[PDB]
């Protein structure tokens, strides 16, 4: 169903829900999953669609981290719990994208689009992902 | 007129106005033109007057980005209307500098100087490129 890249990200997203002991996996954790670590090879974060688009990867991260703090940290029994309805929607939307794109396995990139569409970092100090034109152009230019 | 080095910067500035879908070119886009890409020979950014003037050019880039995100609109059809009276003044100032220097063409050195005369950071302890006197101290190491 999912590519090795998407699986890496979702493994990490679910992992993060348990690492930060959150009540549920949220779009924030997937964004955080994309920000695995500032690895030079980090396609979804250092080399991503936002940094080469409109906003600084370092600041984007700090917002996401603030959101990881804002999502309550709970005991191991209430911790993690679920993938969440929110992502049931994001990932199903990523699947729709796969069909649009003629790709048999879910790309982490498709997750980035579905994910980004739900999220919105509406700070006056906006870090909200650059919209779809910059995101898509940069996605199309990946590797190749 | 302008030579290729100045034209590159000027071209980039106008491009940047369109990269931000803004109706007009502003001093901020030119400052952004000064800091495009990490190519050392670019006096406007790396082997610059800024480092020699004891300033952090990446911090300055953060300042520029902080200002770029404050551009009031990114509307597509409204984009690319004018170079702006503000920069009319700057480019006219560059011409004044050419007269001051007996120079048959505007180099990036001149276009830098002209904007710097009209540039600012709305900051007391500006992290801006070093002020004009230093700009001259180091700019005058170029050509002759």
Swiss-Prot record, chains A, B:
Homohexamer, forming a ring with a central pore. The hexamer is stabilized by high protein concentrations and by ADP or ATP. Oligomerization influences ATP hydrolysis activity at NBD2. Interacts with YDJ1. Interacts (via C-terminal DDLD tetrapeptide) with CNS1, CPR7 and STI1 (via TPR repeats); under respiratory growth conditions. Induction: By heat stress dependent on the heat shock transcription factor HSF1 and the general stress transcription factors MSN2 and MSN4. Expressed at a higher level in respiring cells than in fermenting cells. Expressed in stationary phase cells and spores (at protein level). Required, in concert with Hsp40 (YDJ1) and Hsp70 (SSA1) and small Hsps (HSP26), for the dissociation, resolubilization and refolding of aggregates of damaged proteins after heat or other environmental stresses. Extracts proteins from aggregates by unfolding and threading them in an ATP-dependent process through the axial channel of the protein hexamer, after which they can be refolded by components of the Hsp70/Hsp40 chaperone system. Substrate binding is ATP-dependent, and release of bound polypeptide is triggered by ATP hydrolysis. Present with 32800 molecules/cell in log phase SD medium. Has 2 AAA ATPase type nucleotide-binding domains (NBDs) per monomer, a low-affinity, high-turnover site (NBD1) and a high-affinity site (NBD2) with a 300-fold slower rate of hydrolysis. There is allosteric regulation between the 2 sites. ATP binding to NBD1 triggers binding of polypeptides and stimulates ATP hydrolysis at NBD2. Nucleotide binding to NBD2 is crucial for oligomerization. It is found in: Cytoplasm; Nucleus. This is Heat shock protein 104. Residues 1-144 form the Clp R domain. The gene is HSP104. The chain holds residues 6 to 149 of 908 of the full protein. Belongs to the ClpA/ClpB family. Residues 2-71 are annotated as: Repeat 1. Residues 83-144 are annotated as: Repeat 2.
């Amino acid at each position: 169903q999912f590519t090795e890249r998407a699986l890496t990200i979702l493994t990490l997203a679910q992992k993060l829900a348990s690492d930060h002991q959150h009540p549920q996996l949220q779009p924030i954790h997937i964004l955080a999953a994309f920000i695995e670590t500032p690895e030079d090879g980090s396609v979804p974060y250092l080399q991503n669609l936002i940094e080469k688009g409109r906003y600084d990867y370092d600041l984007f991260k700090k917002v996401v981290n603030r959101n990881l703090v804002r999502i309550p940290q709970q005991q191991p029994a209430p911790a993690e719990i679920t993938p969440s309805y929110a992502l049931g929607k994001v990932l199903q939307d990523a699947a729709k994208i796969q069909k649009q794109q003629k790709d048999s396995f879910i790309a982490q990139d498709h997750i980035l689009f579905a994910l980004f569409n739900d999220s919105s970092i509406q700070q006056i100090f906006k870090e909200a992902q650059v919209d779809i034109e910059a995101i898509k152009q940069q996605a199309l230019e990946l590797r190749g």
